[PDB]
């Protein structure tokens, strides 16, 4: 069935949306990978950082964005789509805070973005922008929260997830590591995320070829770890592993 393939709004005779599936394939096209894990009182996102040139400003190159003061996201997929969806998420969070007087819950922001994407999946006006957004925040009543906002309107919440080329391998690794004492600390969660990326990619990380963002209950502000902190984590945890 290849006729039912060029239009986002056409159901295949068995009821499939091939253009949405192709948007997912587009997610698996930036080459990078991202992982996210939540401990007792923190959430961590770690993304592979490729800077294949000396002339490219690594400070500007990034996939971790601060959606609001207390919510962060890691984007994987086409970069233009990633930044467009990041701007949309920031705008939605600002509108929520304006209308309702309190910071947008992470699950609410994910539902808003997923609804926005579902609209494009249903109507035929745009293409479903091919990016995957993993959001992390600290909810006052639930605790640390990690969510995904794939480009079809699906936004389940996660104990630990991955996106990009090696999402399946990272998922298997995190399943194994979470069946055993899912209760992780801050250092243990950073360990688990970094180890998942390193093992799935089959490489040990320099302090620069990796980008980590973190939120904690004690300090519930999205913080992007600096090079010194990344190196400290890598060296200390590899040594004491």
């Amino acid at each position: 069935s290849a006729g039912f393939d060029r239009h986002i709004t056409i159901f295949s005779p068995e009821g499939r949306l091939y253009q949405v599936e192709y948007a997912f394939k587009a997610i698996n096209q930036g080459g990078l990978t991202s992982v996210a894990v939540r401990g007792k009182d923190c959430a961590v996102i770690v993304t592979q950082k490729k800077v294949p040139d000396k002339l490219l400003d690594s400070s500007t190159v990034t996939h971790l964005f601060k959606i609001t003061e207390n919510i962060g996201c890691v984007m994987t997929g086409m970069t233009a789509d990633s930044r467009s969806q990041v701007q949309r998420a920031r705008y939605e969070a600002a509108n929520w805070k304006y209308k309702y007087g309190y910071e947008i819950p992470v699950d609410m922001l994910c539902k808003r973005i997923a609804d926005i994407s579902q609209v494009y999946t249903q109507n035929a006006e745009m293409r479903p922008l091919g990016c995957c957004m993993i959001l992390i925040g600290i909810d006052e009543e639930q605790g640390p929260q990690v969510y995904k906002c794939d480009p079809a309107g699906y936004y389940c919440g996660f104990k630990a997830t991955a996106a990009g080329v090696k999402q399946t391998e990272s998922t298997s690794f995190l399943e194994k590591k979470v069946k055993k004492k899912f209760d992780w600390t801050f250092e243990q969660t950073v360990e688990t995320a970094i180890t998942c990326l390193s093992t799935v990619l089959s490489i040990d990380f320099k302090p620069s070829e990796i980008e980590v963002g973190v939120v904690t209950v004690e300090n519930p502000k999205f913080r992007i770890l600096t090079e010194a902190e990344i190196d400290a984590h890598l060296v200390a945890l590899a040594e004491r592993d």
């Binding site: 949405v20 079809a152 309107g153």
Partner: protein, 139 residues
């Protein structure tokens, strides 16, 4: 011409299965995944077909499949298939055969010159979980 040629094949089959040249002692068996898309003429409850259903194995039939497949195989004494049958699933006979083959391959690959409940557990998990990795907005 292509749809017409396929219909021509079906018409020839109907002709030869029941027509002016009634065969003597020539029986026919036709296997299919669904009989609902079948032509009413070929499906004719007459001199063209008698219909039988091959459903997914029941629990009792699954017990029988495991016993038959494992008879030739030899195992330990703590490897009761008597609960792998009871565990709910939609595994077919091919699935059970694959489970047994995979458990035997696990044992031989890992030496351990016996087949045990852990081997069957791993093979069963592998086979049952093989039906995954689809998209999750469809559900």
């Amino acid at each position: 011409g292509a749809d017409r040629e396929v219909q021509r094949i079906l018409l020839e089959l109907l002709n030869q299965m029941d027509g002016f040249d009634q065969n003597v002692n020539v029986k026919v068996i036709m296997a299919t995944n669904r009989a609902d898309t079948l032509d009413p003429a070929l499906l004719r409850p007459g001199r063209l077909d008698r219909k039988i259903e091959f459903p997914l194995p029941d629990r009792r039939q699954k017990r029988l499949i495991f016993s038959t497949i494992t008879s030739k195989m030899n195992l330990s004494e703590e490897v009761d298939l008597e609960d792998y049958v009871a565990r709910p699933d939609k595994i077919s006979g091919a699935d059970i055969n694959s489970i047994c083959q995979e458990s035997g391959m696990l044992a031989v690959r890992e030496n351990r010159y016996i087949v045990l409940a852990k081997d069957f557990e791993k093979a069963y998990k592998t086979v049952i979980k093989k039906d995954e990795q689809e998209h999750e907005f469809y559900k």
